[PDB]
Design a protein around this ligand. Structure first.
Ligand SMILES: O=C(NO)[C@H](O)[C@H](O)[C@H](O)CO
Ligand SMILES: O=C(NO)[C@H](O)[C@H](O)[C@H](O)CO
Ligand SMILES: O=C(NO)[C@H](O)[C@H](O)[C@H](O)CO
Ligand SMILES: O=C(NO)[C@H](O)[C@H](O)[C@H](O)CO
Ligand SMILES: O=C(NO)[C@H](O)[C@H](O)[C@H](O)CO
Ligand SMILES: [Ca+2]
Ligand SMILES: [Ca+2]
Ligand SMILES: [Ca+2]
Ligand SMILES: [Cl-]
Ligand SMILES: [Cl-]
Ligand SMILES: [Cl-]
Ligand SMILES: [Cl-]
Ligand SMILES: [Cl-]
Ligand SMILES: [Cl-]
Ligand SMILES: [Cl-]
Ligand SMILES: [Cl-]
Ligand SMILES: [Cl-]
Ligand SMILES: [Cl-]
Ligand SMILES: [Cl-]
Ligand SMILES: [Cl-]
Ligand SMILES: [Cl-]
Ligand SMILES: [Cl-]
Ligand SMILES: [Cl-]
Ligand SMILES: [Cl-]
Ligand SMILES: [Cl-]
Ligand SMILES: [Mg+2]
Ligand SMILES: [Mg+2]
Ligand SMILES: [Mg+2]
Ligand SMILES: [Mg+2]
Ligand SMILES: [Mg+2]
Lengths: 372, 372, 372, 372, 372
């Protein structure tokens, strides 16, 4: 049906703690920056990217949606999401300043909105729309207990609680101290504290260089590390490729990669084992699927990064057959008409029509930010 | 909606000539071998593979459909095509005798029928269902004027008529004489006879070995050969990789590859530049799309092989953005409710709901063969 | 001598326990699916593939034999097994739907029957026919004690028994739990239970992905694992090549590879150390010998998978100079005119004319299935 | 000296023709989009990126300068350009939505401005500031005669005039018709029309795929093509590496690469011979010099793309010892206090203090666009 | 300003001990061998290489400065350091006998002098001149406690004092006994004596062969070695590449590499992780910056070798963004107008105008050697 409006929005949503840090960033709010797209039948779709809620750059994203993309969308058939992807992504003067960064992030929001419309119009949740479930249950792993800002006491207590009270069997812990031996001490303590059956991944958020990583990986050989995420600089294929061959610890990455080209480059190089596409980083669901299919072709597991806090990815992980486990961070879920829900370490299947990207009205009222 | 019936069928359809040959095969009929699947809502989906109309082996495919797969489909929701693909393909005892060959051909027919249903239920042609058109017009190329069984006089007459009467500006001509210099002579004569702006691809159907191809390609350096399809034995990746590096002539292949894995092997090795997935050889549209995505990641053109005489691939080439041109062979199109149609070298865009796999009732009656 | 009849058959034979499982399959019977080929001199040759005894698909193999291949065999000189291998394998309309899967499994059964005729006519067991013995004793390894379906208790009791009562010094144990640390625990217990001089290989039957295998293999570094069989997806060469370089544990594979081409791809990539051809999966003894010669040229060991419960491979392992040890599973032996036999961990050298593929007349009677 | 103001600007400057096209873009104006930075001593520095004068996206770049970066610049010592490059480029919440695209183009404008200040404070032109001249004359090549939008007649006329009247001996001609043989015809005609000692490079602006390029390059074997710029998709390293190996024609690229990492991927793969950094695309002069040094280490020539119509690159090419020739397009030069000037195919060496980025005052009033 | 005089000098400065040794050399003095260059404004710039104070070869370097290079410098504008680098380095008859060795060490002294002038004329320390500080503090590592000539007792004493009294948390210890197990013993003792958070690098000074290194690195697996510097022969890229792949211990090198080309060979081969350019070995600051930029493009750390006891490299490490830590050896610092100074393991940021290369006037009279 015809697109009748495109309306950008910004939400700045509070976190589990007043501030959290990884190796590289410290944040107080999560940005949900996106667009609401309405069709002539009254259907409203929502899509968004995920930011660190820095309002001046959030507004670059919304301005690209309103001023650059909206005129290319109004009056077009929303059904035609694959045609409209190319229309926007490769619009020549936008491509000139694009292919990555702001324009791509804004493209992601639009694309996801169109998919939310499609599934809404069909009257079914997206995972079902796309062709049904590949698993009886998508397992969660808990990232929220693992922030680098946590003192060791708090890291241990939260990790213990997740496992002993909340039924997680999979955690992810941040690393990235200037001296990695501090990380080794932290992980060693977590491993002594929790049951040996608990799987523990780690994430460096691109902090370290190749030689630092080689040493750390050798030092972590007995800690049964499930994967090491973003060990190195995001755009350095070759360093990842060298590291992967130097250790048995699997490398995970993808949350900072904007394009299918970039994923191809890392995958072909053997520089990534756990592939982490993100509909908020890549060009939406349309490009995510292409990356997932690339991963499948290499028989590599798809573990998407929670740029959208798994609101969209719970669908894609329930559906796409290369998928395995699913990141869990509970910061924003209660602000959606259909919150993700994890119990006993398993994500529930979405039930409402769409991609569970529709925020509560009250959340816009309370936490909406002006776009100009 | 629930699947209430799965009924296999075989059509043996006559060709443009009494017999045609390429380097390897001589045939008098094309086999359309597949499944009609009915759902509880009265929708009827069709899908098929393509064979050389050898009845005893055609019945192997239909028996796998009725005897192996129908019990796993009856009563399932036809909507769940992704889940059902895994259910069938990976059914352990079938996988044991499968992963390729007869079981995969049968899987292809089922998977296409389920997509036909899905598009029919949505009330739209498959290309539109998938997300809209990537082009205003898919260009065709004519294979039917190029058979190896044609005398040079007839090869020339047909090629000239395609170009000068029918408006084709793209042809494919078979090669594969024992002495390739005969092919060079044939191609040289075609090149002298038709306008220089006619594009001419060639197809060896896997007849020659690596040294024979190296010499042939060097000898063909002034003939402006668009691609060299299946130059070497179908499962030999390395020989293709070495030829590709030895010549500027592009290599095309895919029509004999059963799996995404095989595609990945060839692509990653640099052993193919024109990727030729085929919904009748791969595990249907579901697996085709994965291969198309894989080729898109490598920025390589998708030019699918007409195993279904392009009745399905017209949709897929209208939609998938890596697609370029489309093989035309007019043998079966008049037996469908929506025939493909080419005018002035361009495929007509499909209009009817479904994947244009629905044969005319009267074509079953006249050309059907008993499945037992 | 001229072939005068080709008669397919199916036997469904019971196992050591009522059900066994590995990482991927659970089965209750073994399918012996094949052909009896009679020559004008009254000699009867038997050859068969090995299936999971799924009757509907067993009948696809037998119908290929009777309806597709029998017409190409009747009247031919059975002596000409090399010429007839090509005649059948490359018959154009059948190659079109083959090269792998059902048509190749059927081909295997025919080929082995022709070899059985050749050795019977000569009056000698196959190993002798081929050129004599490479060893005075083919050592066995016991797979039947290691099924993934066994509880730790039973796994330990069976392993102890094979070693302590039955004189085995080589075992293979299945792995492939969702969490490989459960397999680490099982293996560690076996290692504690049996004498250190027992060689223990493992087999994942294709169940895990590359990063999972990397972590497992690092974790298994002290368990003295003899080989890790089918660690990854069967058709994924690259993942195997990366795993092989990441660990010192040798990789074994081949039971699922249909062709000499697939073996060459894995071997050339350094993706396999223990090469596992199977006459029931490859195109019979004919293609087996090609792959065994390929392995010899790489100075790699040939350790065939017991698709035929070693009834044929005992001959080939006694003869081919690259051969080493031989899988033992005792499920079907007692149904043959010459059962394999293992005493003190060594295979008895066969003595009767042929390839020891002739089943007892009573076992058709009791365990035969109708082919139609 | 302290930075006291940061003021963005947009100029839309008319071209030589009403419209021009390459294979991908059609434009009527050139966008000079940047920042004027004032220090407490009264020095004003100018820097800018280069756009296709699409006002809604130009304003994303300005809004990044004023709303994201100015607050990080006000009160800092302008002299600290290397420290400030990092402060802005790696500011956590901006890196989150950057590393490429709009944030990087804005960084480039700021960086160039701070270099302009530096050389203005020192009272010397940039090339002298950086350490003196590597050549007595930088040779020019004329791109403005070769647009794809030119008829053959006009391409010939203009090329002839550049060479016969204006004293150029180096030209660049666009290619990228859907059928490359039209380009071969065009080039063939140009080669006939102009003297044989005229060097002719070509530029596809990323239009074609690998196989198309392989065939074109073979067919261009006698045209003496100096380089083939952007033959393939901008982010596809592998296709470029494969092409570079397949032809003797040198590959040129860089104008679309945002980072040193991207350049290093292409250079290390042997995917580029003529390295084309651009201060308007990379993060300004600071990042350009890194890339030029990287090219030097590989002994490859540096031939920067005219994103700033060579107002800045004339300095960098007079200084950096890896530099060779310099693109010339005369669209904006007369709008500057020190226009570039080419006589007899050689650039005048700049004389005024600064980076020749200062527009004439009347430029802003006549061609300025409002930033909101 | 014009160069008016070029005057070479030699200082022989005493060390911390009467003699020191590494695996290859024993020395009693450090040679500061360079040039004082005077301009017409009265500014005097100093630059030097670093020798083992062998007077007959020191005088080859001085004689190159005075007899080969001064005539190419007198009357030139000192500001033109990049042009002059080329004029000298590539002067045809000197390049003939150069590109490395004595002519290159002399070039390095001249180049550093011209940079010293530049920063002195601008009235600022070099690090500020080049664009400001990348860090608030450059960390030091102490090499002077680790000489191979130290008994185990003295190695332990000094290491303990550096850490416990002087506040170092980073040390470098020489290795290179004929039997590396003596070094393993030494290191093992050091690791026991000092706190576990002390980082310990090692340096073999090119003493051992590949197999010796492979075994040592394996045996050093629990010693937490930060890097292994110059493990192998200085010009043997391949052995270094093979070693780097065989161990998780990072390789460091560069102090013996004269050119950017050599660095690029090692970096591209993956033969070095810690890049160690030295202004006294490469052609001064000009060539150092090229190599540091090359390392940046590979995201590798730059840790320059103290050929000038870090008098110059303190500036380059405060500025260049790829820099990490800085070698400290206190032998000569007190002989300079601005000594380097380390407190609590951190270098003071230089304050005086110039490159801190200016010796105290009384240095020449007390420690000067005659150049003829
Ligand atoms: O790496 C991640 N998850 O895998 C998170 O995205 C980051 O840690 C947060 O955004 C804070 O920067
Ligand atoms: O190669 C082909 N198209 O590209 C055709 O499929 C074959 O030539 C036909 O099936 C006849 O064997
Ligand atoms: O892998 C094996 N031996 O090595 C066995 O073939 C399988 O475990 C059985 O057929 C059950 O699936
Ligand atoms: O490729 C180029 N120079 O080498 C030009 O930048 C483009 O042709 C213009 O921006 C118009 O798109
Ligand atoms: O290798 C070193 N630092 O890293 C030192 O330069 C040498 O040990 C001294 O020059 C004595 O030969
Ligand atoms: Ca790939
Ligand atoms: Ca081989
Ligand atoms: Ca490099
Ligand atoms: Cl951006
Ligand atoms: Cl997942
Ligand atoms: Cl996983
Ligand atoms: Cl959440
Ligand atoms: Cl607002
Ligand atoms: Cl088959
Ligand atoms: Cl094409
Ligand atoms: Cl047709
Ligand atoms: Cl099959
Ligand atoms: Cl063995
Ligand atoms: Cl048995
Ligand atoms: Cl952007
Ligand atoms: Cl040049
Ligand atoms: Cl201009
Ligand atoms: Cl020398
Ligand atoms: Cl460091
Ligand atoms: Cl010192
Ligand atoms: Mg992460
Ligand atoms: Mg073909
Ligand atoms: Mg097995
Ligand atoms: Mg260009
Ligand atoms: Mg050293």
């Amino acid at each position: 049906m015809k697109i009748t409006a495109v309306e950008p929005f910004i939400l700045h949503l509070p976190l589990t703690s007043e501030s959290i840090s990884d190796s590289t960033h410290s944040i107080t709010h999560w940005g949900v920056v996106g667009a609401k797209i309405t069709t002539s039948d009254g259907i409203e779709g929502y899509g968004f990217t995920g930011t660190h809620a820095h309002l001046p750059s959030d507004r670059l994203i919304t301005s690209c949606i309103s001023d650059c993309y909206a005129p290319l969308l109004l009056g077009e058939d929303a059904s035609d999401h694959s045609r409209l992807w190319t229309k926007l992504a490769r619009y020549p003067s936008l491509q000139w300043v694009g292919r990555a960064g702001i324009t791509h992030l804004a493209l992601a929001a639009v694309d996801v909105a169109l998919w939310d419309i499609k599934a809404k119009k069909a009257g079914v949740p997206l995972w079902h729309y796309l062709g049904g479930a590949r698993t009886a249950g998508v397992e969660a792993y808990n990232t929220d207990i693992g922030w680098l800002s946590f003192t060791l006491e708090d890291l241990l207590a939260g990790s213990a609680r997740a496992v002993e009270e909340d039924g997680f069997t999979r955690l992810k812990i941040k690393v990235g101290h200037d001296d990695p031996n501090i990380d080794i001490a932290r992980l060693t303590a977590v491993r002594e504290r929790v049951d040996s059956a608990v799987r523990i991944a780690i994430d460096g958020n691109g902090k370290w260089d190749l030689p630092t990583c080689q040493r750390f990986c050798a030092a972590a050989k007995d800690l049964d590390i499930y994967w090491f995420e973003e060990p190195l600089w995001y755009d350095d294929v070759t360093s990842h490729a060298r590291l992967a061959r130097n250790t048995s610890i699997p490398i995970a990455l993808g949350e900072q990669l904007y394009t299918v080209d970039a994923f191809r480059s890392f995958i072909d190089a053997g520089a990534v084992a756990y592939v982490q596409p993100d509909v908020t980083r890549l060009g939406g669901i349309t490009e995510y699927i292409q990356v997932a299919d690339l991963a499948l072709a290499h028989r590599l597991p798809v573990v998407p990064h929670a740029g959208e806090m798994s609101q969209v990815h719970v669908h894609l992980s329930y559906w796409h057959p290369a998928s395995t486990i699913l990141e869990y961070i509970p910061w924003i879920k209660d602000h959606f008409e259909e919150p993700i829900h994890v119990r006993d370490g398993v994500y529930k299947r979405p039930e409402q029509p769409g991609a569970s990207t529709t925020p509560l009205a009250e959340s816009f009222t309370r936490y909406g930010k002006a776009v100009k």
